[PDB]
Design a protein around this ligand. Structure first.
Ligand SMILES: CCCCCCCCCCCCCCCCCCCC(=O)O[C@H](COC(=O)CCCCCCCCCCCCCC)COP(=O)(O)OCCN
Ligand SMILES: CCCCCCCCCCCCCCCCCCCC(=O)O[C@H](COC(=O)CCCCCCCCCCCCCC)COP(=O)(O)OCCN
Ligand SMILES: CCCCCCCCCCCCCCCCCCCC(=O)O[C@H](COC(=O)CCCCCCCCCCCCCC)COP(=O)(O)OCCN
Ligand SMILES: CC(C)CCC[C@@H](C)[C@H]1CC[C@H]2[C@@H]3CC=C4C[C@@H](OC(=O)CCC(=O)O)CC[C@]4(C)[C@H]3CC[C@]12C
Ligand SMILES: CC(C)CCC[C@@H](C)[C@H]1CC[C@H]2[C@@H]3CC=C4C[C@@H](OC(=O)CCC(=O)O)CC[C@]4(C)[C@H]3CC[C@]12C
Ligand SMILES: CC(C)CCC[C@@H](C)[C@H]1CC[C@H]2[C@@H]3CC=C4C[C@@H](OC(=O)CCC(=O)O)CC[C@]4(C)[C@H]3CC[C@]12C
Ligand SMILES: CCCCCCCCCCCCO[C@@H]1O[C@H](CO)[C@@H](O[C@H]2O[C@H](CO)[C@@H](O)[C@H](O)[C@H]2O)[C@H](O)[C@H]1O
Ligand SMILES: CCCCCCCCCCCCO[C@@H]1O[C@H](CO)[C@@H](O[C@H]2O[C@H](CO)[C@@H](O)[C@H](O)[C@H]2O)[C@H](O)[C@H]1O
Ligand SMILES: CCCCCCCCCCCCO[C@@H]1O[C@H](CO)[C@@H](O[C@H]2O[C@H](CO)[C@@H](O)[C@H](O)[C@H]2O)[C@H](O)[C@H]1O
Ligand SMILES: CCCCCCCCCCCCO[C@@H]1O[C@H](CO)[C@@H](O[C@H]2O[C@H](CO)[C@@H](O)[C@H](O)[C@H]2O)[C@H](O)[C@H]1O
Ligand SMILES: CCCCCCCCCCCCO[C@@H]1O[C@H](CO)[C@@H](O[C@H]2O[C@H](CO)[C@@H](O)[C@H](O)[C@H]2O)[C@H](O)[C@H]1O
Ligand SMILES: CCc1ccc(S(=O)(=O)c2nnn3c2nc(NCc2cccs2)c2sccc23)cc1
Ligand SMILES: CCc1ccc(S(=O)(=O)c2nnn3c2nc(NCc2cccs2)c2sccc23)cc1
Ligand SMILES: CCc1ccc(S(=O)(=O)c2nnn3c2nc(NCc2cccs2)c2sccc23)cc1
Ligand SMILES: CCc1ccc(S(=O)(=O)c2nnn3c2nc(NCc2cccs2)c2sccc23)cc1
Ligand SMILES: CCc1ccc(S(=O)(=O)c2nnn3c2nc(NCc2cccs2)c2sccc23)cc1
Ligand SMILES: CCc1ccc(S(=O)(=O)c2nnn3c2nc(NCc2cccs2)c2sccc23)cc1
Lengths: 355, 355, 355
């Protein structure tokens, strides 16, 4: 049993090589699963299978649209002659996994609106281009792309269609125009505890708590530190939402924890080596990202758009561009970013080489 | 006759030298005409004369304001000691040609509102500065400026004034707040065919189909491939507008084809060498730019602004920053970008040098 | 007396060294005062004391919140191991001075709303991070950060809270939806003359004319050329507001002169060496910044936000990125930027070295 566990954990490098030998259809399936799991920074195909099972538990229509987005984007990246090493780590399929899931989430035509498969494909062909263009700009300065391709594609689509499109109408994004009445005596501790997996689930747009638990299980299969930081970031988003007197139904829905969950995953050991200083910095980034999330939600509601994960991308890029003279606050080279355990081993060896 | 034709086609280099010898007033007239024609990437003074005739066919007031914008911007670039080689190719006068035409298009005071000549001049003095600043930023990474100076100047002006300015009121940009009723049985094939020149005309803000035909004739005088790609991009914008169930009156007005016309001109042989792969990529950029055009139109209608050619600039910069490992998808060096025929000859010679 | 005057003018380098010898609490007080004064580009602790006296003349609650912002941001920059040379010149405390003053200005809970000290601190801990991140990006290309950290922090906060927050409600930013009735016969020359110090005061959000006079006195203590350009930029903003038929009550309140005052300070001898050409360019930047100020005010009123000093930052970055071939339009190296008198001496010596 421990052999199989070590085989299915981390990034699954042994299977990656074994499939490099295998036919290209199996490799394509592998790239699709890694692209599904890469939404939570996880480059693991079994984590991708678990995340797909969680999406099917939420809504099979969303799983279908998201898997089709992943497939169309990986095929489009193959057609555009992109780096095969980036395609095989699923880095050309996760933005379109998100595009496909959240075009169905933000759709006003209900489940199994088959015509929606036409814009899905369309926007899933724009995600490699986005992913390529940004990966140029941001790799000049050794910065990750994050989910900026998904965010640009979805903002473009939801602006192009809107609520009043005769073909593909979107959900109505309403700005707030009256103060909410919060009854602090009706606050549930159980619902606040349940909001921790629901924010991890809302990373994919899924309000199911079982879906969020399955996503946390997938992240834990890849790296336990990633799971810890996902849970902690969702909790810190809950805390920020309570600090701004947000409606409890928005915290219970997990809308306050998914951006900060992603930001705590990214900062806590992933793109910054894991020390206690970078752990505290990841907590600060999670709180900052929750507050920027409500800021961008309120601001983009005015133009009829959802904030999505714009807050995570902007806040995490801000915290990665930030420089300190602290040697224990170390930004990982993008070429050596695998998962927090290996990242920490690499950082410790480099810190020994520094002394 | 063939000698004169070869003399008036392309970029007219022979006249450029002959005028380099001539007095500076004739050279200034040449730079003004090249700045007029440079709105459609054409560095030809006779094309500029034809485009000016088309503008006079549309509206002589718009021709006056646009020509005055060109003059003021070229004089301002001379005063700011800008590169004379950029001034003499009209690259300091086309953004202000657009500023001057579309300050009168988007004006709520009617034709021959003489006071409008005061903000025109003002904004036409901002277009060299814009053009200079951006040309710094974007030439670090060998990227064209496009009509970003015009877009920033016009967004700034139409925000500063707005619909309720007592002096210079602008047109009211209304967001959509109800679903349009489209009667697909009333769709005209003749109006859809006529919308192809009207999008090329709307490149300058002109809804006349004769003006669009004259603009296509000017582009054809410069380079037939540019004319082909202008027409094809306007057609692809028509197609995208039909695919999103747009009101037919917006497709007939050419609002769906001018951004994609510009994007197909830029990508189809101009800033990317012309192969069949880059032709298909230019078709994809034209479609993407039509969809981003309706997206940005809907989004900027919320802040009371028109999208203008923000979609063309953003989408074409995105497609130029994109990298592939395809050798036949070749991005032209900005120093060697003349017009698609010479660009293709240069690319073929460089590809022979590569082997 | 002249010895003391020479001791308290400029940047006060002698005191900076003498305090480098002194205990760290006195040095921290010095850094706080320099961070207060650095809002008007002044690196002088006695100017900071005078600006603090002006803030107390306006509103002691705003002085308290702004001083606490400065303190929290300087301590946070110390904790984040930022450059001590930047911390000691007050370059990590002025954006939070602004954050603290204008969180109380834009607050809907009145004076001495003690709970406001909690978000103040919070946003004052975000200003070093902002300041650090941007100072990375913008120092690659030798550009000043300006008040972009303050603007990002305040936009984020005022979006996160808004007018309808149950805890920290903000002021209601209303868009214009009807044409203002201006009675040009009721225009006061005395109020227009008084609007010159009120725009300098509104640099900090203060509508008191005595506060603006005290701020001009502080700037004059540092550098008389800075005071001259502050007054001239506020006047040019008055002129632009009259040219766009703005409501007189907005010009009298100083909302038209503070962005252009900052832009004339920055361009007139500060970040560009002071020649007569750069003086005229600073006048042009002041006018451009007034017009961009009303543009961004009208545009950001649509999303419920104030423009603040976004216009100053964007317009001054645009005018600094602009390149000319004029040798007498010289951009100062950021490492040699002290105050216009020393900047001009440095430029004259470098121009002798150029010949
Ligand atoms: C790639 C291209 C995507 C396919 C284009 C559109 C799907 C097929 C046409 C849609 C259509 O008219 O058929 C459905 C018939 O009604 C029904 O609901 C009957 C269901 C049968 C429709 C076909 C089922 C699968 C079609 C897609 C292929 C799967 C590929 C993966 C419409 O359904 P509706 O859109 O009105 O839905 C209702 C919920 N709003
Ligand atoms: C460069 C500076 C531009 C010039 C500043 C403004 C133009 C002259 C003042 C405008 C003015 O009051 O004269 C017009 C008198 O009425 C009329 O309509 C009479 C027409 C005569 C006005 C002058 C004709 C040309 C003036 C500009 C010089 C040309 C330079 C090129 C106003 O007209 P209006 O603005 O109310 O228009 C009506 C359509 N809304
Ligand atoms: C750093 C952390 C900042 C402190 C957190 C909040 C301040 C203290 C709690 C606030 C509180 O409930 O006390 C006040 C009691 O009422 C009063 O107005 C009584 C005034 C006494 C309150 C305490 C005075 C200073 C507290 C802050 C410490 C100073 C550090 C610098 C509320 O006042 P309110 O907020 O309703 O104001 C009214 C104008 N809207
Ligand atoms: C909630 C929002 C609005 C603001 C977010 C602020 C955070 C980004 C701050 C708050 C607490 C800060 C932390 C407080 C304490 C430390 C320990 C500090 O460690 C040291 O300086 C000790 C000596 C050494 O490590 O060598 C390094 C910075 C760090 C992690 C800080 C990183 C930045 C944090 C997370
Ligand atoms: C409509 C919107 C929402 C999406 C726009 C997608 C386009 C950018 C795509 C769709 C079709 C694509 C084209 C489909 C086929 C090809 C041929 C392909 O050629 C090869 O790979 C063959 C071998 C070789 O050229 O060496 C190069 C990419 C290209 C031009 C593609 C470029 C990108 C295009 C235009
Ligand atoms: C009001 C808004 C909408 C537009 C703002 C335009 C300004 C940026 C322009 C208008 C006047 C211009 C100035 C007009 C005259 C001159 C003198 C000129 O000096 C020379 O060329 C003389 C020879 C030499 O200096 O060697 C240098 C540019 C400058 C300062 C210009 C700088 C740019 C200015 C300030
Ligand atoms: C493996 C790492 C992560 C493990 C954490 C697993 C957390 C999953 C627990 C979710 C429990 C939610 O519990 C159930 O949620 C559903 C929503 O469909 C509610 O139903 C509404 C039920 O009333 C509630 O009991
Ligand atoms: C919420 C509670 C969760 C706490 C979990 C903390 C996870 C990361 C913090 C610790 C990371 O690893 C820590 O790195 C620093 C390096 O500076 C080491 O030193 C510590 O010995 C080690 O514990
Ligand atoms: C040279 C390359 C390009 C050549 C293409 C030329 C296309 C120009 C054809 C435009 C024809 C428009 O035709 C006319 O348009 C006017 C609008 O003013 C309509 O009038 C409304 C007429 O009913 C219609 O017949
Ligand atoms: C719509 C219909 C318009 C079609 C016109 C296509 C214009 C550009 C496509 C062809 C460009 O030129 C093409 O370049 C490729 C290079 O890979 C050459 O090989 C082809 O022989 C040549 O035809
Ligand atoms: C030292 C360099 C700068 C020196 C310039 C000093 C200018 C300061 C003069 C401000 C005078 C304002 O004058 C007073 O303003 C107050 C507002 O509180 C008005 O009261 C309303 C008074 O009716 C008006 O007389
Ligand atoms: C064009 C293809 C491309 C996509 C993303 C990146 S990248 O720069 O973003 C990035 N480089 N390494 N890397 C990245 N992205 C990850 N996860 C995806 C997500 C980001 C935000 C939310 S999920 C993970 S996981 C292990 C390593 C990495 C670079 C190139
Ligand atoms: C900080 C509070 C907050 C943040 C973001 C959004 S929001 O504007 O993003 C958004 N508004 N409605 N809404 C949104 N987000 C969703 N899922 C999370 C996402 C995952 C990836 C992209 S969205 C879902 S699921 C059903 C409705 C919605 C709204 C509120
Ligand atoms: C500051 C002056 C300046 C303006 C534009 C550019 S630039 O970088 O934009 C560009 N460099 N070469 N070049 C460009 N622009 C063209 N056409 C103008 C239009 C662009 C978008 C719509 S029209 C054409 S036509 C033949 C060659 C070119 C660079 C510098
Ligand atoms: C994709 C559909 C669409 C795109 C852009 C615009 S739009 O927001 O640009 C605009 N809204 N009204 N309007 C606009 N565009 C015009 N001409 C095109 C231009 C040339 C260069 C800059 S604008 C004219 S002409 C008379 C009215 C208008 C509106 C709709
Ligand atoms: C991260 C800390 C940091 C803050 C600002 C700058 S910086 O790049 O902005 C700048 N570099 N030098 N310098 C600057 N800023 C000044 N004034 C502050 C204001 C700017 C706009 C309005 S007040 C003055 S005054 C004398 C020299 C300078 C660089 C680094
Ligand atoms: C060109 C005209 C104009 C410019 C900016 C703003 S505005 O949107 O900035 C703003 N709207 N209300 N308001 C604002 N600005 C203030 N002070 C100036 C500042 C200093 C630093 C940041 S704000 C104050 S003081 C009390 C109310 C306000 C409004 C109008």
């Amino acid at each position: 049993f421990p052999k199989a566990l070590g085989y299915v954990t981390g990034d699954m490098k042994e299977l990656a090589n074994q499939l490099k030998d295998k036919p290209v259809v199996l490799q394509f399936i592998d790239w699709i699963l890694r692209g599904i799991s890469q939404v939570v920074f996880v480059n693991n195909p079994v984590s991708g299978i678990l995340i797909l099972v969680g999406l099917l538990v939420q809504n099979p229509w969303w799983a279908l649209t998201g898997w089709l987005g992943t497939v169309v984007s990986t095929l489009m990246a193959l057609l555009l002659s992109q780096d095969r090493s980036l395609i095989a780590s699923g880095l050309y399929g996760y933005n379109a996994t998100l595009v496909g899931v959240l075009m169905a989430v933000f759709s006003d035509k209900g489940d199994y609106f088959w015509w929606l498969l036409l814009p899905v494909c369309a926007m899933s062909m724009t995600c490699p281009i986005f992913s390529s263009a940004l990966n140029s700009v941001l790799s000049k300065w050794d910065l990750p792309v994050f989910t900026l391709p998904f965010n640009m594609a979805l903002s473009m689509y939801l602006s192009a269609t809107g609520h009043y499109n005769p073909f593909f109408p979107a959900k109505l994004v309403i700005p707030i125009t009256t103060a909410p009445q919060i009854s602090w005596s009706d606050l549930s501790a159980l619902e606040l505890l349940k909001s921790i997996p629901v924010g991890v689930g809302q990373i994919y747009g899924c309000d199911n708590p079982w879906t969020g638990g399955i996503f946390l299980g997938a992240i834990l299969l890849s790296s336990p530190l990633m799971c810890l930081h996902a849970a902690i970031g969702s909790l810190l988003g809950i805390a920020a939402g309570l600090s701004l007197s947000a409606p409890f139904e928005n915290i219970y829905f997990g809308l306050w924890g998914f951006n900060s969950s992603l930001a705590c995953i990214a900062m806590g050991g992933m793109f910054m080596a894991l020390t206690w200083q970078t752990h505290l910095l990841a907590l600060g980034c999670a709180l900052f990202t929750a507050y920027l999330g409500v800021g961008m939600a309120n601001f983009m509601a005015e133009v009829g758009l959802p904030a999505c994960t714009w807050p995570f991308c902007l806040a995490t890029l801000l915290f990665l561009i930030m420089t300190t003279k602290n040697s224990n606050i170390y930004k990982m080279p993008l070429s050596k970013v695998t998962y927090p355990e290996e990242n920490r081993i690499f950082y410790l060896q480099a810190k020994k080489r520094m002394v």
